[PDB]
Amino acid sequence: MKPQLLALKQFVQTEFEKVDFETFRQNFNRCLEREQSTLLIYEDDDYDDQSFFLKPMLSDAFFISSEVVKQVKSCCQSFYEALTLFISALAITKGVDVGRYHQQLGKRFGVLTVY
Amino acid sequence: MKPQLLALKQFVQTEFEKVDFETFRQNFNRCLEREQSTLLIYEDDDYDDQSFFLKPMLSDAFFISSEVVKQLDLPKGDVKSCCQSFYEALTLFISALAITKGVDVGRYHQQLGKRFGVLTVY
Amino acid sequence: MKPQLLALKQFVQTEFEKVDFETFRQNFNRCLEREQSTLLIYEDDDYDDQSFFLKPMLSDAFFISSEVVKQLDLPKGDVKSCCQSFYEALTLFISALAITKGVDVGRYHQQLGKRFGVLTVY
């Protein structure tokens, strides 16, 4: 078996051994339920799972959030507000200035931005 | 008897009678079937079982995770991709570890990936 | 100066001095020009330049290929067709992927074909 593999397994194993199990187990269980809940996805330290799955679950959860916020300028305000953090991540990621990015989003749509 | 033990019993007992049986029954059978699959221990709402069994299954399943991802063979397989797969399966496990040792999740993950050549979730 | 470095320079320097210059020049100039056209990046004897620059020239060229194969025109291309053209321009590249991770080429190509609606080379 590859040395890098072995040392990594060695590591996660060794680190699991020198930790209080009952505490660990409660923490692992909490992270698990929080992950598998799949609904308030945009606040979930999620993006924990495999990329090809989360990616699609991303587009999925966009449609759903839109469904739940639609009951007109107000509906878009709701959609925007649930994605504030997300939207900032898009800017950090496309090498653009947050603030500028939010503001443009707000101008192009009838939304009041966090910047 | 011991009154406290009594109440605990009275509670889950009463709890059980005031829930739709047939709906409970299915979740129970589903949870069970889920607990007893023995393979994806790391996403398993598991850690339900007793610590003596869980703790060993832990080391057990690691040995197995490592064996199934090390697709270098002697038809080759690079070092990063193999370690990437071992990590991508332990992601949730790794954050808990961090929560548990009072470490900044995120930094924990990042150190992990620097030490071993892995593309981490943080 | 590091003797190993000196030997290394000595070698390419000497190898250069005893080769037909004019034939060398055309070849250098032809490799350099093919290298600098940057767009048909996935068939260029490329992955000649530094890793850090190549790594993102890579991801950047991906984005470009994605916008150059999409002729949806809002008249149309159509999902199936645009992905196919994306897949066929990456055919060799995809094989390098499966080779590198020690996975069976073909099996890899086929999975890619079933995950998306692409007719594969294998």
Coordinates of C-alpha atoms in Angstrom, one line a residue, chain B:
Chain B
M1 CA -37.5 -1.4 41.2
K2 CA -35.8 2.0 40.8
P3 CA -38.3 4.9 40.1
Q4 CA -36.1 6.7 37.6
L5 CA -35.6 3.6 35.5
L6 CA -39.4 3.3 35.8
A7 CA -40.0 6.7 34.3
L8 CA -37.5 6.4 31.5
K9 CA -39.4 3.2 30.5
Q10 CA -42.8 4.9 31.0
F11 CA -41.6 7.7 28.7
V12 CA -40.4 5.8 25.6
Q13 CA -43.4 3.5 26.1
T14 CA -45.9 6.4 26.1
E15 CA -44.0 8.1 23.4
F16 CA -44.4 4.9 21.2
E17 CA -48.1 4.6 21.8
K18 CA -48.9 8.2 20.8
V19 CA -47.1 7.9 17.4
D20 CA -48.6 6.3 14.3
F21 CA -47.4 2.7 14.7
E22 CA -47.1 1.8 11.0
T23 CA -45.2 5.0 10.3
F24 CA -42.9 4.5 13.2
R25 CA -42.4 0.8 12.2
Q26 CA -41.1 1.8 8.8
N27 CA -38.7 4.4 10.1
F28 CA -37.5 1.9 12.6
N29 CA -37.0 -0.8 10.0
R30 CA -35.4 1.8 7.8
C31 CA -33.0 3.0 10.5
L32 CA -32.2 -0.6 11.4
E33 CA -31.6 -1.7 7.8
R34 CA -29.4 1.4 7.6
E35 CA -27.4 0.6 10.7
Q36 CA -26.7 -3.0 9.7
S37 CA -25.4 -2.5 6.1
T38 CA -21.8 -2.5 7.2
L39 CA -19.7 -0.6 4.7
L40 CA -20.4 3.2 4.6
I41 CA -20.0 3.5 8.3
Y42 CA -18.9 7.2 7.8
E43 CA -22.2 8.6 6.6
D44 CA -24.2 6.2 8.6
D45 CA -26.4 7.7 11.1
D46 CA -24.6 5.2 13.2
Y47 CA -22.7 5.9 16.4
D48 CA -26.0 4.6 17.7
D49 CA -24.3 1.3 18.7
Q50 CA -22.2 0.8 21.7
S51 CA -18.7 2.4 21.7
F52 CA -16.9 -0.9 21.9
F53 CA -18.3 -2.0 18.6
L54 CA -18.2 1.4 16.9
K55 CA -14.6 2.1 17.9
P56 CA -13.4 -1.1 16.3
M57 CA -15.7 -0.7 13.2
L58 CA -13.9 2.6 12.9
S59 CA -10.4 1.2 12.6
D60 CA -12.0 -1.7 10.7
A61 CA -13.6 0.4 8.0
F62 CA -10.5 2.6 7.7
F63 CA -8.4 -0.4 6.7
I64 CA -11.1 -1.2 4.2
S65 CA -11.4 2.4 2.9
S66 CA -7.6 2.5 2.4
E67 CA -7.6 -0.8 0.6
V68 CA -10.4 0.0 -1.8
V69 CA -9.0 3.4 -2.8
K70 CA -5.3 2.4 -3.2
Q71 CA -5.7 1.5 -6.8
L72 CA -2.0 1.6 -7.5
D73 CA -1.5 -2.1 -8.2
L74 CA 2.0 -3.2 -9.2
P75 CA -3.2 -0.4 -14.6
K76 CA -1.3 1.9 -12.2
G77 CA -2.7 4.8 -10.1
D78 CA -1.2 8.1 -8.8
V79 CA -0.7 9.1 -5.2
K80 CA -2.9 12.2 -5.0
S81 CA -6.1 10.6 -6.5
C82 CA -5.9 7.7 -4.1
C83 CA -5.5 9.9 -1.1
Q84 CA -8.2 12.2 -2.5
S85 CA -10.7 9.4 -2.4
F86 CA -9.8 8.4 1.2
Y87 CA -10.3 12.0 2.3
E88 CA -13.5 12.7 0.3
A89 CA -15.0 9.7 2.2
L90 CA -13.9 10.9 5.6
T91 CA -14.8 14.6 5.2
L92 CA -17.7 14.6 7.8
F93 CA -15.6 12.4 10.1
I94 CA -12.7 14.9 9.9
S95 CA -14.8 17.9 10.9
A96 CA -16.2 16.1 13.9
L97 CA -12.6 15.3 14.9
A98 CA -11.9 19.1 14.7
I99 CA -15.1 20.0 16.7
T100 CA -14.0 17.4 19.2
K101 CA -10.4 18.6 19.7
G102 CA -11.5 22.2 19.9
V103 CA -9.8 23.0 16.6
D104 CA -10.8 25.4 13.9
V105 CA -12.7 23.2 11.5
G106 CA -11.3 24.5 8.2
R107 CA -7.8 24.9 9.5
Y108 CA -7.9 21.3 10.6
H109 CA -9.0 20.3 7.1
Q110 CA -6.4 22.6 5.5
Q111 CA -3.5 21.2 7.5
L112 CA -4.7 17.8 6.5
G113 CA -4.5 18.6 2.8
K114 CA -1.1 20.4 3.1
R115 CA 0.6 17.5 4.9
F116 CA -0.9 14.9 2.5
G117 CA -1.4 16.1 -1.0
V118 CA -5.2 16.5 -0.8
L119 CA -7.7 19.0 -2.2
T120 CA -9.7 19.8 1.0
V121 CA -13.2 21.0 1.5
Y122 CA -11.8 24.2 3.2

